[PDB]
Design a protein around this ligand. Structure first.
Ligand SMILES: CCCCCCCCCCC(CCCCCCCCCC)(CO[C@@H]1O[C@H](CO)[C@@H](O[C@H]2O[C@H](CO)[C@@H](O)[C@H](O)[C@H]2O)[C@H](O)[C@H]1O)CO[C@@H]1O[C@H](CO)[C@@H](O[C@H]2O[C@H](CO)[C@@H](O)[C@H](O)[C@H]2O)[C@H](O)[C@H]1O
Ligand SMILES: CCCCCCCCCCC(CCCCCCCCCC)(CO[C@@H]1O[C@H](CO)[C@@H](O[C@H]2O[C@H](CO)[C@@H](O)[C@H](O)[C@H]2O)[C@H](O)[C@H]1O)CO[C@@H]1O[C@H](CO)[C@@H](O[C@H]2O[C@H](CO)[C@@H](O)[C@H](O)[C@H]2O)[C@H](O)[C@H]1O
Ligand SMILES: CCCCCCCC/C=C\CCCCCCCC(=O)O[C@H](COC(=O)CCCCCCCCCCCCCCC)COP(=O)([O-])OCC[N+](C)(C)C
Ligand SMILES: CCCCCCCC/C=C\CCCCCCCC(=O)O[C@H](COC(=O)CCCCCCCCCCCCCCC)COP(=O)([O-])OCC[N+](C)(C)C
Ligand SMILES: CCCCCCCC/C=C\CCCCCCCC(=O)O[C@H](COC(=O)CCCCCCCCCCCCCCC)COP(=O)([O-])OCC[N+](C)(C)C
Ligand SMILES: CCCCCCCC/C=C\CCCCCCCC(=O)O[C@H](COC(=O)CCCCCCCCCCCCCCC)COP(=O)([O-])OCC[N+](C)(C)C
Ligand SMILES: CCCCCCCC/C=C\CCCCCCCC(=O)O[C@H](COC(=O)CCCCCCCCCCCCCCC)COP(=O)([O-])OCC[N+](C)(C)C
Ligand SMILES: CC(C)CCC[C@@H](C)[C@H]1CC[C@H]2[C@@H]3CC=C4C[C@@H](O)CC[C@]4(C)[C@H]3CC[C@]12C
Ligand SMILES: CC(C)CCC[C@@H](C)[C@H]1CC[C@H]2[C@@H]3CC=C4C[C@@H](O)CC[C@]4(C)[C@H]3CC[C@]12C
Ligand SMILES: CC(C)CCC[C@@H](C)[C@H]1CC[C@H]2[C@@H]3CC=C4C[C@@H](O)CC[C@]4(C)[C@H]3CC[C@]12C
Ligand SMILES: CC(C)CCC[C@@H](C)[C@H]1CC[C@H]2[C@@H]3CC=C4C[C@@H](O)CC[C@]4(C)[C@H]3CC[C@]12C
Ligand SMILES: CC(C)CCC[C@@H](C)[C@H]1CC[C@H]2[C@@H]3CC=C4C[C@@H](O)CC[C@]4(C)[C@H]3CC[C@]12C
Ligand SMILES: CC(C)CCC[C@@H](C)[C@H]1CC[C@H]2[C@@H]3CC=C4C[C@@H](O)CC[C@]4(C)[C@H]3CC[C@]12C
Ligand SMILES: CC(C)CCC[C@@H](C)[C@H]1CC[C@H]2[C@@H]3CC=C4C[C@@H](O)CC[C@]4(C)[C@H]3CC[C@]12C
Ligand SMILES: CC(C)CCC[C@@H](C)[C@H]1CC[C@H]2[C@@H]3CC=C4C[C@@H](O)CC[C@]4(C)[C@H]3CC[C@]12C
Ligand SMILES: [I-]
Ligand SMILES: [I-]
Ligand SMILES: [I-]
Ligand SMILES: [I-]
Lengths: 613, 613
């Protein structure tokens, strides 16, 4: 059919260049962006129902996630109230529900516990002073996270969540699910376990839990087990029986209400000594300035918490924006969430982000603009000021059981590891390394280690590329690996090397080794042997995949050219890009008899030029 | 002249594949490697003179570098004696002199001081107990460094010194020169400065030195100043007046001998209260087992010290092996230096490597096999057992002044910085970052920060590549950037994108943005708009520079292909390598109507195929 017919001069870089010559209302996102653009006629009612539903869900979610953080139940209500109010202004996303997201809450609680242990703080037991210190530490960490997020918004470096690769995100998610399960399993059993801060901490906690399982509160354990079973069964029924009832079943809220009513009717606090919350303040606490002197002990934790929370927020926002066909500004997501975390930290709250389950609840029940968020915040507020007393008899085991039941989706990511291994071993290695690191480390330290391991994998992949010795398909200009096709004909007296990577320090050492192996000799050795006494005449370097080039790369290429020219062997570079040749010429490569006449467009001009001599 | 004439079928990947089918005496390096091959007839005498000269230099260097480490003078003699003996066996290199190399000594001393401060150890002043503790800490660190080096030799991962890029090596060298200068300036002034451990430590030390400059010992300062001046003057004369006297002038040894004799004659210890060494033990101390319990506090320091010492050793070994036309095994350099550091740590020595000045002295005075090293070790031994008393009146200011005088070569790299900036800004950024980090951090922490910053620079360079929209030179098959050559003709209804980087998570986000900008529209947006209602017909991706590919890359490519096919826009991949296509097919790319018929050999088969329709 169609044919590849081309007739043109043999163009080196010099000849080709001679013939073809080269050469104010967003950083503070207004509510006025959509409030005048609102649809009160029909959007308002949908926003009302969506906000009521997601507020009912988020009040419970904040109460439960206040257990992940080492703060008393009641400050989760503030963490579910204030950030939504202060995100309604600066938020690009219009479908996400702002709240604790128990992974971020667990990291905050780890930081708070490490900075306020039971034995280190209390020598009496002073529960009130300990709780005050824990709340202050959580507020300080939230303020630092907000400061970091706002700074990253000013720097406009919103691509950092790119560095959170999907394999390491999955591994970190599985490890965080394990950590959350261990903490909430400590909570449901109502066992007293001394806090372990450091390496292997989750294993120490599990060991102590298995040792103290004899002190398990029976009523709390049964309540947690039944809550887990009921929530899981109803979730499975909803997933299976999904054709009807498009709205998800709010099983967690119903179970919590039933548990609270039963505990109030039976008085589990004193008859069975169940671990009820026992303390939910009524009213709004006045703002306080967090002690910034602790910022030095929270930097590595605040950075990772900010990164993780922002990544979750933008992930959910993008998932719903592609569905609803709009865009979200990542830098403005920085700005909004940093302002939110600063505002919440001034008001005794832990770090805030979005939760996938709460966002799904908000969207599925008539998801519209952030007015639904305002309605949810109002519901949380009326829970704070009116329903605080009604939730006193609720056991903490029920909340921890709800969290554990929701942990199943995060736990099921271990099934992707064999698939990753079969597809790309590097990604499976990243997954496993991130999971293991986040297990035996802090979650913040695990995330940092995963990021560094991803960088290491990228560097290693660009450092040990696929290099080949090429030859031409007969009667064509297609140069393929000689040992791969069995019909490749080797040219007479010339070796062609394809080094499929940008050449840098690691790659300059690798490329020297590859050239020495391909040509079959070392230029230094043969030159020295010839000097002491006193098969290849040309080497073509297929540099099509050489992306960038550093000073070490230019120096190595210059040394290779000189060393091979010393033994009357010519080195020709082919398929180099314009920018790489510009980097070569600005690094002083074209000095001492180089003159750019040894640079050809592809690896067929070089071979044709050689055949002309 | 020569012409580029090719007549061949238009080959897609499918058609091309259908028509062209694919498919025990070294780990313990013996002295018997060269001892039977020795040249006693004429090599022995040259070895004798070379060993005598380099031993005279190395005794002084060991005593001087024992001040960089926080150990008494006399243990530097052991550090210059034992490692040479135990490297004569396992060493591949035959020209290097094994010893302290004051940068490694300074890192060891920083570790030792941070673990045995004056105030933390002594509450009386117990100089003897403090010195014993410092020696034990130095021996423990040396043993840990040797263990790490031996493990790295077992793993055969000798390419890690590749990761020590020349810019970061230069920045670390300049910062280490500054640190050594500050410490030896504290020593020469004989000022009592409390040790600062942590961040900004060198600036605190400089501040305290400038505050205590009123307590400077005048005699020690004058001795150090004249030692520095004489060393600089003689070195400059030797560099200039270099045609005669090929052997370098051992000015440091002569200066030390003269200073020792003058101090003995005048008794500066009592008359002028000069800071003489005052204590050099006579004889060999028995070996002791270091306390391994300190290994937990030395891991980050020992890793960096081992890496730096091995890098210096292999750098010097390669510099002299290329000159003398032989090869050195990097893994065996691990093995030899790990055994050396273990042996020396058992015998109260700090970490050992090679020094460029001492190696130059050994080589220039008749450099031959490591028998010269044995002679140097014998000279150090006879200095230990006989000349220990003769060096008692020598001031420490003379030794510190010798080190400061030798620091000039390390200091001269701020001159290399500006041309690095003018050539490759990334390498200059790496240089400056490594220098500043190693200044305000530990030297070990600075090295780790520089290595990880180099990894970050590689990741960023492969993450933000040079991408272009290509068009064809008329009547040829050369596709160049349309906005760069001004004679490029845009083809009808097709856009060609060259993304000059391997496609991974950072690059998948970048590539989505680049495709959307190049084609001028978003596939999701136009598809959604067309669904709501109810200029380019093909996109060619020049993937010549796509080196590797991950699961995220394959997912992004499938997503792009499907999104563009949904709007009747065909996506063709060109110039993909065989291994990248293998990765695509093993990652499930060729499912759901892909069939590999949209993959062409170069970006001219795709265009010719399009013109056929
Ligand atoms: C954007 C890019 C990323 C940015 C990342 C930023 C990280 C910042 C780390 C900051 C840092 C190192 C600085 C140098 C780091 C060099 C790294 C080189 C890396 C080379 C590749 C500061 O180090 C010093 O720490 C002192 C406290 O020790 C602190 O306080 C002193 O002065 C105060 C008055 O100022 C005074 O009030 C106070 O009394 C003094 O003590 C000092 O101010 C501070 O300088 C280490 O501190 C961090 O915080 C904790 C400290 O304990 C520690 O927490 C862990 O605890 C758990 C166990 O308990 C553990 O299990 C958890 O994991 C974790 O909760 C962190 O782990 C650590 O990291
Ligand atoms: C191949 C690639 C590189 C590998 C690098 C390997 C680094 C290993 C670091 C090990 C490490 C963290 C472990 C987790 C790290 C996670 C990193 C995640 C990074 C993610 C990107 C261990 O952490 C704990 O430290 C305890 C001591 O604090 C130690 O001792 C405890 O138990 C003992 C009984 O076991 C008991 O006897 C003892 O009493 C207990 O206290 C514990 O055993 C140990 O687990 C930190 O320790 C290292 O050593 C020092 C400690 O102080 C510290 O020294 C600094 O001091 C200067 C100021 O004074 C500072 O200015 C200098 O800089 C530096 O001299 C280092 O900085 C630190 O690093
Ligand atoms: C502390 C930091 C972490 C250190 C630990 C090490 C971290 C790195 C760990 C190592 C990387 C592990 C990658 C995955 C191992 C194989 C998984 C698998 O499916 O087996 C295979 C079987 O599946 P198949 O395809 O049927 O065959
Ligand atoms: C660590 C090196 C960084 C890259 C690892 C992944 C990589 O490229 O290899 C992967 C293999 O990996 C393995 O075969 C397992 C060895 C990995 C050991 C990791 C230890 C972590 C501590 C590469 O996989 P492949 O190129 O498809 O072969
Ligand atoms: C803070 C400072 C940190 C510094 C760094 C510290 C960590 C340094 C880590 C470095 C360890 C790297 C291990 C992985 C090597 C590459 C594996 C891989 O798939 O990459 C490439 C292929 O690889 C190859 O072609 C083979 C290369 C082998 C090189 C090692 C030989 C000996 C190993 C030891 C064996 C044990 C006995 C992938 O190619 P692609 O096509 O691009 O995909
Ligand atoms: C972190 C930066 C990692 C990449 C550095 C190289 C890079 O892209 O810039 C390099 C220059 O760098 C700059 O022009 C200055 C910006 C670098 C700031 C570094 C701060 C370190 C803390 C980019 O160099 P270029 O692409 O030639 O332009
Ligand atoms: C703990 C570690 C965690 C993970 C790491 C976290 C840290 C990661 C650090 C690394 C950050 C490195 C940034 C380098 C940027 C690329 C530079 C460049 O020339 O490349 C491209 C342009 O640059 C871009 O396209 C980039 C996006 C533009 C906006 C950037 C922010 C500036 C906002 C403005 C602010 C103004 C005020 C062009 O590429 P080319 O064609 O090659 O030329
Ligand atoms: C929807 C429901 C499951 C929410 C949780 C309700 C809680 C408060 C209820 C449900 C079932 C109850 C348990 C049922 C049976 C027993 C056995 C009895 O000898 C002690 C009380 C104990 C252990 C009860 C404790 C309280 C309990 C766990
Ligand atoms: C709290 C403690 C017990 C958590 C321990 C989690 C560890 C042991 C788990 C978490 C994820 C797991 C990995 C997930 C998937 C695979 C692939 C399959 O071939 C089994 C091994 C392997 C590689 C698993 C090994 C064990 C693993 C790393
Ligand atoms: C403590 C735990 C996490 C230890 C490790 C157990 C987990 C990770 C292991 C054990 C059982 C494994 C599963 C067994 C069988 C299959 C079928 C295969 O077609 C896909 C992977 C999948 C689904 C495996 C995924 C990894 C797996 C879930
Ligand atoms: C990809 C790269 C950057 C990951 C680097 C991870 C390193 C720094 C981490 C991972 C696991 C860590 C180890 C985990 C456990 C212990 C035991 C403890 O008693 C001393 C510290 C020590 C020995 C840690 C040292 C640091 C360590 C080796
Ligand atoms: C050639 C080199 C090696 C000689 C070094 C010997 C040293 C110890 C000698 C040489 C010159 C000497 C100085 C000469 C002059 C004075 C001034 C006097 O009021 C106090 C002693 C003092 C400050 C001497 C101290 C010791 C000194 C510094
Ligand atoms: C102990 C203290 C004084 C050490 C201080 C070291 C710092 C301040 C020095 C060391 C090397 C220096 C750099 C060396 C070279 C250049 C290039 C020129 O354009 C001046 C700026 C710049 C980039 C310098 C900036 C300052 C610098 C980074
Ligand atoms: C900018 C270009 C033209 C400079 C050309 C000469 C270069 C090699 C020289 C001239 C003056 C030098 C600077 C002079 C003073 C200092 C301060 C100190 O911290 C050392 C580095 C630094 C910053 C030097 C770096 C190197 C330097 C900039
Ligand atoms: C490329 C990567 C590895 C570089 C990482 C560098 C980071 C971890 C280092 C570089 C300089 C460091 C800072 C230097 C000085 C101080 C002041 C001290 O009171 C608290 C810690 C703090 C604030 C350090 C935190 C960690 C830090 C920001
Ligand atoms: I969730
Ligand atoms: I949940
Ligand atoms: I030296
Ligand atoms: I020296």
């Amino acid at each position: 059919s169609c044919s590849y017919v081309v007739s043109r001069p043999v163009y080196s870089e010099l000849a080709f260049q001679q013939q073809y010559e080269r050469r104010v209302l967003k950083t503070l996102l207004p509510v006025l962006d959509w409030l005048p653009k609102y649809r009160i006629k029909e959007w308002l009612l949908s926003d009302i129902i969506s906000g009521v539903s997601t507020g009912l869900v988020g009040t419970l979610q904040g109460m439960a996630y206040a257990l992940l953080a080492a703060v008393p139940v009641g400050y989760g209500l503030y963490s579910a109230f204030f950030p939504i109010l202060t995100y309604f202004i600066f938020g690009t996303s219009r479908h996400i529900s702002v709240g604790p997201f128990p992974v971020v809450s667990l990291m905050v609680g780890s930081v708070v516990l490490s900075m306020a242990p039971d034995e280190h703080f209390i020598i009496s037991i002073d529960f009130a002073a300990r709780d005050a210190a824990r709340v202050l530490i959580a507020s300080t960490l939230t303020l630092l996270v907000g400061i970091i997020q706002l700074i990253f918004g000013g720097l406009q470096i919103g691509f950092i969540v790119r560095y959170l690769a999907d394999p390491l995100v999955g591994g970190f998610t599985t490890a965080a699910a394990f950590q959350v399960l261990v903490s909430q399993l400590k909570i449901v059993l109502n066992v007293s376990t001394k806090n372990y801060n450091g390496i292997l901490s989750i294993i120490y906690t599990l060991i102590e839990i298995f040792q103290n399982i004899g002190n398990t509160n029976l009523a709390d354990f049964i309540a947690g087990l039944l809550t887990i079973i009921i929530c899981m069964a109803v979730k499975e029924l909803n997933d299976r029986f999904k054709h009807k009832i498009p709205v998800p079943i709010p099983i967690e809220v119903i179970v919590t209400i039933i548990a609270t009513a039963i505990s109030y009717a039976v008085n589990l606090e004193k008859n069975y000594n169940a671990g009820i919350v026992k303390s939910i303040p009524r009213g709004f606490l006045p703002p306080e300035i967090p002690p910034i002197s602790l910022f030095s002990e929270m930097l590595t934790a605040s950075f990772s918490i900010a990164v993780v929370a922002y990544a979750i927020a933008v992930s959910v926002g993008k998932v719903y924006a592609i569905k609803y066909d709009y865009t979200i500004d990542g830098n403005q997501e920085f700005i909004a969430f940093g302002i939110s975390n600063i505002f919440s930290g001034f008001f005794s709250c832990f770090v805030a982000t979005t939760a996938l389950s709460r966002t799904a609840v908000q969207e599925s029940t008539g998801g519209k603009t952030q007015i639904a968020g305002i309605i949810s915040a109002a519901v949380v507020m009326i829970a704070i000021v009116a329903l605080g007393k009604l939730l006193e008899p609720l056991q903490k085991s029920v909340l921890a059981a709800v969290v554990i039941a929701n942990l199943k989706g995060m736990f099921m990511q271990v099934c992707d590891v064999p698939r990753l291994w079969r597809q790309n071993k590097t990604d499976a290695v990243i997954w496993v390394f991130t999971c293991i690191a986040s297990i035996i480390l802090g979650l913040d330290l695990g995330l940092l280690a995963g990021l560094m391991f991803g960088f290491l994998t990228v560097v290693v992949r660009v450092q040990f590329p696929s290099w080949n010795s090429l030859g031409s398909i007969p009667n064509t200009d297609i140069y393929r690996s000689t040992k791969d096709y069995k019909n490749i004909e080797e040219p007479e007296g010339v070796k062609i090397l394809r080094f499929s990577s940008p050449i840098f320090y690691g790659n300059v050492d690798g490329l020297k080794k590859c050239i020495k192996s391909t040509v079959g000799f070392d230029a230094i050795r043969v030159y020295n042997k010839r000097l002491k006494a006193l098969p290849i005449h040309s080497l073509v370097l297929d540099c099509g995949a050489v992306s960038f080039l550093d000073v070490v790369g230019v120096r190595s290429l210059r040394m290779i050219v000189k060393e091979f020219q010393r033994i009357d062997v010519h080195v020709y570079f082919a398929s180099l890009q314009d920018h790489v040749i510009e980097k070569l010429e600005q690094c002083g490569f074209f000095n001492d008899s180089i003159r750019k006449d040894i640079f050809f467009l592809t690896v067929h001009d070089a071979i044709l030029h050689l055949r002309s001599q």
